[PDB]
């Protein structure tokens, strides 16, 4: 016999909805990445995508411990000489609240085309409403 | 102000305080006794 | 602790309302509202308020003491009130009042106008004296400090704006 392997033409996927109010950033991102990759199914296959679609609501109400609201710094570089830029957690929450969760989850996924395709099944909103009522998502408690 | 690694009481009217993670000396009699550790 | 173990009496003619941590006090001179820290429990028995720590916080007693002092000041201010006095020293310096605006002349080449906040009154007995009246201790102190900031007392003569009971040292050239 030879071991079973999944086939991308026949794979089931479901839609879930999650709320982020008063939750810890890293301990939420771990579960999100695990379910995006598909490690909770017995049909797991390293070179195939066997994950689910997840919606996250209330992204501007996540929580951090310690003095991280004023001391966590995000860096980046522009490509021009001297172009190093930085932002703080509070400024990020004020300007672009979804990027926090997006970056946190992106850091925890495989690096390559398959990981880039995995990332496409995450939908993050900054409020309490979404326009995916035709897909009939189910409530997931993490 | 005096910026030093060693801050001490220099007379009888000096007081040692800790503000925002810094040790300081404040005097009610002599403005020359103000000190800051750094 | 030793300050949190002395109940606060509530004289006749004042009203207290407590909802969780929000406390309101009303009296002949006005009304004041506050929100306490989440480690103190305040109890109204018959004629006094008592303060104590909850269970599960490591700094209950300090918070209890702070709450005690704050509420004592509230009670005092809702019946009697608070007053402050300011003095001016120098040649040509003067002050006047119109509505809720104080006009100061203090040796500059432009006028100085200060706008009082809600709940504070000012009057000028002489041209070189200011008296402030109110019901909120912190606000009265902040207004006095702001007024003093314009021209602080100097060490060689003592000119400027000073408190009534302040000792201002001087030295020679």
């Amino acid at each position: 016999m030879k071991t079973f392997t999944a086939k991308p033409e026949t794979v089931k996927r479901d839609w879930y909805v999650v709320d982020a109010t008063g939750k810890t950033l890293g301990r939420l991102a771990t579960e999100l990445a695990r379910r995006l990759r598909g490690k909770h199914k017995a049909e797991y296959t390293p070179h195939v995508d066997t994950g689910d679609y997840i919606i996250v609501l209330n992204a501007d109400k996540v929580a951090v411990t310690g003095n991280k609201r004023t001391d966590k710094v995000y860096y980046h570089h522009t490509g021009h000489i001297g172009g190093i830029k930085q932002a703080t957690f509070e400024e990020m929450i004020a300007r672009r609240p979804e990027r926090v969760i997006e970056i946190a989850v992106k850091g925890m996924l495989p690096k390559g085309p398959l990981g880039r395709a995995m990332f496409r099944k995450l939908k993050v909103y900054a409020g309490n409403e979404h326009n995916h009522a035709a897909q009939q998502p189910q409530v997931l408690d993490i | 102000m005096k910026v030093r690694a060693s801050v001490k009481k220099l007379c009888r009217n000096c007081k040692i305080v800790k503000r925002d993670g810094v040790i300081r000396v404040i005097c009610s009699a002599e403005p020359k006794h103000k000190q800051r550790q750094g | 602790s030793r300050v949190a173990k002395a109940p606060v009496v509530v004289p006749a003619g004042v009203d207290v309302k407590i909802n969780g941590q929000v406390i309101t006090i009303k009296g002949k001179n006005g009304e004041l509202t506050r929100t306490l820290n989440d480690a103190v429990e305040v109890k109204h028995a018959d004629n006094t308020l008592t303060f104590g720590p909850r269970d599960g916080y490591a700094d209950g007693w300090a918070q209890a003491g702070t709450a005690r002092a704050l509420l004592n000041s509230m009670v005092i201010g809702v019946t009697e009130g608070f007053t402050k006095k300011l003095q001016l020293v120098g040649v040509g310096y003067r002050a006047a009042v119109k509505g809720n605006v104080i006009n100061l002349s203090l040796g500059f080449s432009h006028p100085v106008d200060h706008q009082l906040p809600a709940g504070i009154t000012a009057e000028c007995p002489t041209q070189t004296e200011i008296v402030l009246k109110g019901a909120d201790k912190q606000v009265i102190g902040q207004v006095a400090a702001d007024l003093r900031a314009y021209r602080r007392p100097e060490p060689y003569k003592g000119k400027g704006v000073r408190y009534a009971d302040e000792v201002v040292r001087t030295k020679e050239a």
Partner: protein, 59 residues
């Protein structure tokens, strides 16, 4: 690969891989990981039976 699949299958019945293997060892079952993964994918009633056996052994 076999170990990862067995972990996924066991956490759906309510136990973890390490405890499941310990329970099988104490129950004297000698089935290997290849066959366990095969059964996990192609037959779930039998896998539930095995998990109950392991839980009873650990109890």
């Amino acid at each position: 690969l076999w170990i990862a699949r067995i972990n996924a299958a066991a956490r759906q019945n309510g136990i973890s891989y390490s405890k499941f293997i310990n329970g099988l060892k104490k129950a004297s079952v000698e089935i290997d990981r290849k066959i366990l993964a095969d059964i996990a994918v192609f037959d779930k009633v039998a896998f539930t039976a095995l998990v109950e056996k392991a839980k009873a052994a650990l109890a």
